[PDB]
Design a protein around this ligand. Structure first.
Ligand SMILES: [Zn+2]
Lengths: 231, 100
């Protein structure tokens, strides 16, 4: 499903956020960790945002182990959070929009869509962002931006990813020239024919500029893989 | 100098080892030291050109007004237009009462 289902496997948007007045997961107490996940149960767990759907909180404490396996596989949570006591996943019925809680940051919003639809995913994630912001005091600073545990995330707190299947570009030996070009363009690639492309930096650019550039480059890859298949 | 975070507790040398911040206020406490770090991670960039949250964004604009106004007061006091410094004193009170 999704635009370019043949080529792009998915489009991912991730927004890291922390409570202003609560210690980051590096030093916060268990009571602090518990309050965040209760504040999410109370104010978000049975709530609809229109167009995105109903969210339902999964407390990891209450979650069966194989349930956590499926959440890991489906990419709704990360492996560290399976053993996290107060970790949680606030998930839409659609399972496309999720809000991971008490992992590296207090909050990590995720939009994972099928096609090549970065912007739809940006738009959706900024909605969940503003929604949570209505009732949660974000750890923000007008000069440095959103404040996160790692400095690799500070600023926009946005990590944007596109997953692409490019068999023909591997076969044509083109792939060897393209990875060097991606890097010099402010993006990073990782891995038999599946590549994931994300933004390098999170400070000094706007979120529009981040998604814009990632989208532009992904678009040209889409046209190159299609041209290599026609060959 | 070399202080610790009044809330995290974390001191800069801890931050060097661990590589992860303690709380909001570690950015405040290590501001000077962080900037070379950000310059290096984000291709020389150091200032958020991004998004302002909705709710608290307006309260942060008010604190900007306040502080500009706090400076107009200071000139006016070094100058001697004191009828107008009376005005700014009360303008600042106004903007803080709106926060309350
Ligand atoms: Zn701090």
């Amino acid at each position: 499903k999704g635009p370019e289902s043949d080529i792009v496997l998915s489009s991912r948007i991730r927004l890291a956020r922390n409570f202003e007045h609560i210690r980051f997961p590096t030093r916060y107490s268990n009571e602090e960790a518990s309050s965040i996940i209760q504040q999410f149960e109370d104010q978000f767990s049975e709530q609809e945002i229109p167009g995105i759907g109903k969210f339902v909180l999964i407390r990891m404490n209450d979650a069966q182990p194989l349930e956590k396996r499926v959440l890991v596989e489906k990419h709704l949570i990360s492996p560290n959070l399976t053993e996290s006591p107060f970790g949680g996943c606030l998930l839409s019925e659609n399972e496309e929009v999720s809000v991971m809680l008490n992992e590296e940051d207090h909050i990590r919003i995720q939009c994972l869509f099928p096609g090549f639809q970065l912007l739809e995913a940006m738009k959706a994630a900024n909605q969940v962002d503003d929604w949570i912001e209505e009732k949660v005091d974000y750890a923000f600073n007008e000069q440095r931006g959103y404040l996160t545990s790692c400095p690799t995330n500070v600023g926009t707190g946005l990590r944007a990813s596109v997953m692409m299947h490019l068999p023909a570009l591997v076969l044509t030996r083109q792939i060897n020239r393209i990875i060097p070009a991606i890097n010099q363009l402010g993006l990073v690639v990782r891995g038999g024919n599946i590549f994931q492309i994300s933004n390098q930096i999170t400070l000094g650019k706007s979120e529009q500029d981040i998604v814009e550039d990632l989208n532009s480059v992904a678009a040209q890859l889409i046209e190159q893989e299609r041209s290599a298949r026609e060959a | 100098q070399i202080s610790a975070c009044p809330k995290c507790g974390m001191t800069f040398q801890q931050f060097r080892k661990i590589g992860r911040f303690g709380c909001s206020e570690c950015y405040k406490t290590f501001h000077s030291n962080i900037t070379p770090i950000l310059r290096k991670v984000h291709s020389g960039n150091t200032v958020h050109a991004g998004k302002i949250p909705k709710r608290i964004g307006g309260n942060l604009h008010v604190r900007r007004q306040i502080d500009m106004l706090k400076k107009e007061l200071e000139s006016l006091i070094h100058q001697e237009e004191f009828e107008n410094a009376a005005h700014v004193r009360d303008q600042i009170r106004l903007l803080e009462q709106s926060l309350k």
